[PDB]
């Protein structure tokens, strides 16, 4: 264990590119093991690659780093945060995830998402398709990838970013909504349920080409005089 955890960071220190700061990375690596810490930073490292990681952790700072892969993660990790990397792929996620924050990275697809999971920040990638969204979900941003379509939403979202991805169609939304950013998509309809969310909510679909008809619908209804809908913000030419 510890005895041979340093045997392979020594190892991986040795072969870091001129750029790389492997070498703080060995001492936090180090002392986050040696006191059993349960956050670990390496964030700001220049690091390309990482060597697997202190078990106890619960928190994982690696963000503005190069990795292109991670490391299988620790088992009772609880949230990660991997922006502005060059990562194309994810480790499998621990029962115990509850953030996973991979914004400005390059991935395509993503792994099965834990039941615990809360909060899911994947903008800015390559993302082509969604897996099953959690229960527990509470923000969903996935704005800014390559997503035409997207999976059901679970009951007690909250949040939700689509913004900039080429959708064509949008589930219906709970009831839980609060913000929903769906700009710069190819919506031309929308589910009924936008016009049930709650009187504070608020709906974003900017950029979108919504059909005359759907336009119409909506300007009547929100303009009755017991319209309790949220706001709705568009935009033209």
Not at 5 to 24: A, C, D, H
Not at 41 to 50: C, I, Q, R, W
Not at 126 to 137: A, G, N, Q, S
Not at 159 to 178: D, K, R, V, W, Y
Request: aromatic share 6%.
């Amino acid at each position: 264990c510890n005895e041979y955890y340093l045997k392979v960071w020594s190892e991986w220190e040795k072969n870091g590119t001129p750029g790389e700061q492997r070498n703080i990375a060995f001492n936090r690596l180090k002392i986050c093991l040696q006191n059993q810490e349960a956050e670990l930073n390496l964030s700001e490292l220049d690091l390309k690659t990482l060597p697997d990681l202190p078990p106890q952790i619960t928190t994982l700072e690696i963000r503005k780093n190069l990795l292109t892969h991670l490391p299988d993660l620790p088992p009772m990790l609880k949230v990660i945060h991997a922006q502005f990397n060059q990562l194309e792929s994810l480790p499998a996620l621990p029962e115990t995830l509850e953030e996973l924050n991979a914004g400005d990275n390059k991935i395509k697809e993503l792994p099965f998402l834990p039941e615990n999971l809360t909060h899911l920040r994947v903008h800015n990638n390559r993302l082509h398709i969604l897996p099953l969204l959690p229960p527990e979900l509470k923000l969903l941003v996935v704005s800014g990838n390559r997503l035409d379509s997207i999976p059901p939403f679970p009951d007690k979202l909250e949040g939700l970013a689509l913004a900039n991805n080429f959708i064509e169609q949008l589930p219906e939304l709970p009831f839980s909504m609060n913000r929903a950013v769906l700009m710069n998509n190819n919506l031309t309809t929308l589910p009924e349920s936008v016009l049930r969310l709650a009187q504070n909510a608020f709906v974003n679909v900017a950029g979108n080409p919504l059909s005359g008809h759907t336009m119409r619908t909506l300007q009547q209804i929100t303009t009755g005089p017991d319209y309790s809908g949220p706001r709705i913000f568009f935009s033209m030419g």
